[model samples]
Target: GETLGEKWKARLNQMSALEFYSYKKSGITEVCREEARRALKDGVATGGHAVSRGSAKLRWLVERGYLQPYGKVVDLGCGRGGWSYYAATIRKVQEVRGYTKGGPGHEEPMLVQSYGWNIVRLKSGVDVFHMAAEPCDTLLCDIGESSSSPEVEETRTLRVLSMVGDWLEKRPGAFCIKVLCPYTSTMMETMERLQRRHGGGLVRVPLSRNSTHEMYWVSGAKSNIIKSVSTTSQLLLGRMDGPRRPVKYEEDVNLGSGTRA
Candidate 1:
C-alpha cells in the first residue's frame, strides 16, 4: 500500500529526537528536545520518509575520531540540527553551523534555543555572510537520502559536492557527505574516478550494528582544482558496480557493535 507522506510526518512528530539512535550516539542522554519529544509522544511524528543510509559512515567517523573535536564544522541541511548537535556538542567541537529553511511549530524554536548558540543557522541568499574556521575543518552535508525524489536528490547531491569541492581547496581539512549507496564497487569506482581527477580519496563509513542500506562518503581534496579523470570513466564505472545486486560498499560493518563482517 502506498503510504501518505503526511502520515509519516505525523509519525515523526510523535517520536522525539531521543527515539533516533543517532541522537543517542551523539550523547543526548536525556530527552531535552521537549517539543520533538512531545510531538512524538502525542503521535504526531512524521518525516520518516527521509531515509539516511549514512548513519554507518557517521558512526564510523565518530568512533574512529577522524572527525575530531575542534575547528569549524557545518551541517548544510541541518533540519532541527540533530546531526549538527551531535558533531558540535557531543563531539566537543569548537564551532558548528547549520543552514536550513525554518519550519513552523514552536517546538522547533525551543529545540534550537536548547541546542546552544554554538549551533548557528543560515538563511538562503544572505547578501553578506561568512564562516571563520581560523582553520576550517569539516563540512558535513546530508544532502539527499534514498527516499528523496530522483530529480531532487540528484540536484541536491551535485550541488553539495560542487560546493564542498570549492571549499576544500581553501579549507584546511576534509569533506563529509551522507548518501544512499546502492553498493560498494559502484561507490568506490565513482569515488576513484573523482579522486583521480580531483586529487583525493573516498572512504565509506558504515553506521549500524544492524542495518545495511546506509553509507557515507568522506572525500578529501587539496586546494586549487585540477582536473584528474574524465567523466567517461565515471560513466563506465557506474555501469559495472552501479546497481545490479548487493555490492561491496560496507567496508568494516563487522567492527561496529554486535555487527559482524
Candidate 2:
C-alpha cells in the first residue's frame, strides 16, 4: 500500500459545500447543489477511496481532444460509482450511467444518495431505458471485477462491447474501455479485431505516472470519412511523449485479512 501511494494521488477540491454553504442556506440558487456535487466529485473520501489506474487514464483522454467536453456517457462496473459521479456531476457530460454490484461502501442507501441524481446505477440484466443503437457520445467501462479470469471475462466483456457498439452505431461517437494492464497478446489482438469489426481504429495511450499497469483507449469518429493508417500513427506517436506522469497516492488502503467478504 505504501508503494501504491507513491504512484498515484489526486488533489480533491474539498471544502466545496462549506464554501457554498451559506449561499445554499439562503436558497440563493440551485447552483449550490452543483457546487456540493463538484466537491464530492473531485475529493476522494478521507475513508480512502482514491482514484484507480483506469481513472487516471480517462482524465488524460478528456484533457486531450480525444473526447468531447460534454456528451452522453456510461461507466460499466462502476464501483461506488466514482467515475460516473465525476462525469455526471463534475464534468460537463450531458448524461451518465453507472453499473455496479454496490460493493462494500456503496451497499447503503444514504451513501449512494450522496452521489446526486444525475448518475444512474443498473444491476446486471436490467433493461436500460435507451437502446445501444440510440447513439451515446461516449461509453467507458472500467469494471475491474469483470475480468479476473480471461476465459469468463470475455463473455461478459463481449456482451458489454456489443451493447456499446450497437449504441455507438446509432449515436455515432467515441468509446473507451479499461482492460487489465499488461494485457495478454490475445486481448490486444482481440481489441484490434473488434475495432476493425466496428470500422474504427485503436490507440494505446500510455501514462507517464500511471498505476503499474497501462490502460488502452480505443476511439473513433462518427463521421463517415476514415483517416489513413499513417495519419493515425502520427497522432498516436505524437501523444506518446506528453508531459503527464504518475503522481503520489492520496491515501493508503487498509487491507485486512479476515472472513469479511
Candidate 3:
C-alpha cells in the first residue's frame, strides 16, 4: 500500500497556493531590469507576497519584539521583497535594505522601487553585504523552501548562520534565520551557542508548518553567550538534538496570485 505521507504529498501537489491556505511563494520571474523596477514603483510591492510565509514571519518578529520599530534592517535572501516591504512600511524601520541573489541586475530594481521606503537590493554579488558591512538594527535570513539540494540547503543555512552571527556580534542587534528542517544537532547547537555569544536568547519556532519543513532561530534582545552550563558544554535539549519530525505540510504549492512574497 502507498504510504500515507506519499499519498498526501501526491494529492497536495496538484493544489494551488490558494486552494490549500494563505501561503505565498517567493519566485523571481526573470524580468527585464526596467520592467522589474517599474513593477515595484508602480505599486507592485504593495502587499506583494502578503500571504507568503515570509511576510507573516516578519510580522511575527515585530509582534514578538525581536524586530524593533526603528533603525536599519536588512533581509538576506529577501524573496519577492514582502518581508522587506513590511519591515520598511509597517514596522517603520529606518534604512531598510534587502539582499537577493535571485538575479543580479533585475534583482535590485525589483526591490529598490518598493515604495521607495529605503529598500535597496544589495547587488555586488555578495561583495558588499557579506564582506564586512556596517552594522544594522536587525537582520533576517530566509532562503525559501527549496534551494538546490538537501545537502546544499543544510550547508547554506550553516554558512548564512555564520554571516548572521558576525553581523549581530558587530552591532548586537536582533536576528532570525529560516533553515530547512531535518537539521542536524550541530546546527541547533551552533545556533544556541551563537545566540549565547551574541548576548541574545534564541527561540526555535516552526514557520509555515502547513507548507514547508522549516523553522526559524530568533534572538530576543540573553545573557552574554553562556559559555558553560553545567559541568559540560554539551546540551541535549530533548531529542531536538536529533532528526526533526516536522508536521506534514503542503509541498510544491505554488501561488498564482499577483506579485509573489
Candidate 4:
C-alpha cells in the first residue's frame, strides 16, 4: 500500500511491545487516542492508530481465546477497514466482511493492494443491527457516538444491547464489542445479559488508557456450560446476588468540599 498506514504498519513492525504500549498510550489520556494532536501536527492522520489498534485487538482476541484463526470474521462500524485489513493480512482469518455507514466503507485501495487478499470485503452504508443478522464465526462490534454525552451514550447502548440479543438468537460465535464507558450501567447489564444467554463466560478488560473510558468485552457460547452466570458476573463485576440493579446516582451539587466521597 502506498500511504501513511503503510508506513505506520512498518513502524509498528519494528516497534517493541513496550514501545507499542507507549505508542498506544500517547495522547490517549485526552478525549481521543494518540491520533488527535499528532494527526494534526505531524499530519499522520491516525498517528499509527490503524496498525496499533489492530495489533491490540489481535492480542485481545487471541490471548483471551475469543479469536480463532481461519474463522469467518465480521466487523461492525468498521471505518476505512484498518482492523479488518489487519485481521486478513496477519491473523489469517478466513474472510473479513466489515460493515459501516461512515466513509465509503471500502477498504483503503492501498491496503487492499498491500495485502493483496481478495477475500476481505466491505458492506458500506449499513447499521450494526442489519449486519448482526447474518451470522459469522467472530463478531466484532464498534457502534459508537460521534460526541460523548450522557443522553447520547444511553441511546447507543440501547441500540447495541438490542442488536447483540438478536444476533445471539441465531448461531453465535465469539463476539468482542468495543463497549461504551464502564460507567454506563446499561452497557454492563448488556454484557451480563449476553453472558447468560450463551454458555461462554464473559470477560471485560480495560486498556491502560483508562481516561478514554472504553473497554473490550468478549463472550460466546460453549458446550456443556460449566460455569454459572452469577459466578462469572461476580468474578467480573462483583457481588451481583440480587434481582437487578440500576445505575443511578445523585451528584454532589455543592462544589469544592461538599460531602464528596
What TM-score would each prediction reach against the true structure? 0.47, 0.47, 0.56, 0.56
For model 1, the superposed segments whose C-alpha errors exceed 4 Å read 1-36, 39-60, 90-92, 103-135, 147-156, 181-188, 196-214, 219-261
Lowest lDDT sum, 10 consecutive residues, model 3, at 230-239
Give the Cα lDDT of each candidate.
0.41, 0.41, 0.48, 0.48
Query: Residue-wise lDDT of candidate 2 within 120-170, one digit each (tens)?
Result: 444443233243344466776664333224445545545555555565565
lDDT of 3 by residue, 1-261 (tens): 432222333344555755444322221011113433354456664423232345555665667776564567777777566566666654345666766655555343243333434443444244323456557777777754454354565576676665666676666366666655323445556756666556454333333333333545566644222232210112212212234343433222111232222
What does the lDDT read for residue 181 in candidate 1? 38
Give the higher-TM-score candidate: 1 or 3. Answer: 3
Q: Give candidate 2's TM-score.
A: 0.47
Superposed model 2: Cα runs more than 4 Å off: 1-55, 89-92, 103-135, 144-163, 181-185, 197-214, 220-261
Residue-level lDDT tens digits of model 1 in 1-261? 212222232343454554433321221111223344454355442311111223234545766644553467776656555555445434345677666544553113113322233444434321112433233576676654443243344444455555556555665355566544323333335555555654543333322221112334554423221122222223223333223332233332111111111
Q: lDDT tens string, model 4, 162-237? A: 7766665665466666655333444445556655666454333433331233445566334221233223323322
**Model 3 root-mean-square deviation:** 10.9
RMSD score of candidate 4 (Å): 17.6
Quote the positional error of residue 188 for candidate 3 in Å.
2.1
**Candidate 1, run of 10 with poorest lDDT:** 252-261
Off by over 4 Å in 3: 1-53, 90-92, 104-130, 144-150, 199-211, 221-261
Enumerate residue pairs that collide in model 4. Answer: none
